[PDB]
From a paper:
Here, we provide the ligand/enzyme crystal complexes for one such PTP outlier: Arabidopsis thaliana Plant and Fungi Atypical Dual Specificity Phosphatase 1 (AtPFA-DSP1), herein unveiled as a regioselective and efficient phosphatase towards inositol pyrophosphate (PP-InsP) signaling molecules. Although the WPD loop is missing its canonical tripeptide motif, this structural element contributes to catalysis by assisting PP-InsP delivery into the catalytic pocket, for a choreographed exchange with phosphate reaction product. Subsequently, an intramolecular proton donation by PP-InsP substrate is posited to substitute functionally for the absent aspartate/glutamate general-acid. Additionally, we conclude that the hydrolyzed phosphate remains trapped as an enzyme-product complex, until it can be released in a prisoner exchange with another PP-InsP molecule; the latter process is assisted by the WPD loop.
In experiments in which crystals of wild type AtPFA-DSP149–215 were soaked with reduced concentrations of 5-InsP7 at pH 8.0, we observed a near-planar, triangular-shaped electron density consistent with a metaphosphate; all three of its presumed P–O bonds are an appropriate 1.5 Å in length. There was no evidence of a pentacovalent phosphorane that would have signified an associative reaction pathway. The putative metaphosphate intermediate in wild type enzyme is stabilized by intensive polar contacts with a cluster of residues in the P-loop, Lys151, Arg152, Lys154, His155, and Arg156, including the latter’s positively charged guanidinium group. A metaphosphate is an excellent target for capturing a polarized water molecule, to generate the Pi end-product. We identified a potential candidate, Wat2, in both wild type and Cys150Ser mutant enzymes, and in both cases Wat2 could be activated by the His155 Janus residue. The Nδ1 in His155 is in the Nε2-protonated τ tautomer state, stabilized by a carbonyl oxygen from the backbone of Lys186. In addition, a π-cation interaction can be formed between Arg188 and His155 which is expected to further assist the latter’s deprotonation. Nevertheless, in the wild type enzyme, the 3.7 Å distance and 144° angle from Wat2 to the metaphosphate are not an optimal environment for this reaction, which in addition to the latter’s intensive contacts with P-loop residues (see above), are factors that may assist our crystallographic capture of this proposed intermediate state.
Numbering used by the authors: 50 to 214
The structure:
C-alpha cells in the first residue's frame, strides 16, 4: 500500500521547485508522480546510466552545474555555477524542477538559500531552512556564501510562478 519513496532529504521549495539528495531506482516511482521537466544537478560526477534512462523515459532535461564536493574548512563554492543554476530555476518553462546534489544539504542548500534571497527572506529565516536540511552537517561557509552572494543581476526577473506574490 505505502509504496512511494521520496529521495534523500526530499522537500518542496516552492510551486514547481523541489530539492533532494541523489535519487536511486527506489525513488523513481515517486519522482515520476511529480511530472518533472528538469533536474538541476550540482555534482561534477557523470550521471549514472540508471538515472540517465529514468530522465530519457520520463522526458526530463538534465542541467549539470558541477560544484566540487569540498570539506570544511576547505570549501570554495563557485559563484558562476550557482548563478547559472539560478537562471535555469527562474525560467518557469523548466518547472517542475528537482535540485539535487549528493545529500541535498550543502550545494543544494546554497542554491535554495540564494533563491530565498531573491524572494526577500531575511538571512536568519534562510539560514534556519538551510540548517533544517543540513542538521549536524550544517556549514558556516555555506551560510556565509548565501550572505555575500550578489543577486543584483536577477532583480529584474519576475517570479509570477511563486506561492509568495
Ligand atoms: O551533496 P551535498 O549535500 O552537496
Amino acid at each position: 500500500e505505502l509504496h512511494l519513496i521520496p529521495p534523500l532529504n526530499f522537500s518542496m521549495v516552492d510551486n514547481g521547485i523541489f530539492r533532494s539528495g541523489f535519487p536511486d531506482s527506489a525513488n523513481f516511482s515517486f519522482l515520476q508522480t511529480l511530472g518533472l521537466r528538469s533536474i538541476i544537478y550540482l555534482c561534477p560526477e557523470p550521471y549514472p546510466e540508471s538515472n540517465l534512462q529514468f530522465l530519457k523515459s520520463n522526458g526530463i532535461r538534465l542541467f549539470q552545474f558541477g560544484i566540487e564536493g569540498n570539506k570544511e574548512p576547505f570549501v570554495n563554492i563557485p559563484d558562476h555555477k550557482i548563478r547559472m543554476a539560478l537562471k535555469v530555476l527562474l525560467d518557469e518553462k523548466n518547472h517542475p524542477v528537482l535540485i539535487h546534489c549528493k545529500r541535498g544539504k550543502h550545494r543544494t542548500g546554497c542554491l535554495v538559500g540564494c533563491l530565498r534571497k531573491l524572494q526577500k527572506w531575511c538571512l536568519t529565516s534562510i539560514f534556519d531552512e538551510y540548517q533544517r536540511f543540513a542538521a549536524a552537517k550544517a556549514r558556516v561557509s555555506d551560510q556565509r556564501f548565501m550572505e555575500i552572494f550578489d543577486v543584483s543581476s536577477f532583480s529584474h526577473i519576475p517570479m509570477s510562478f511563486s506561492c509568495s506574490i
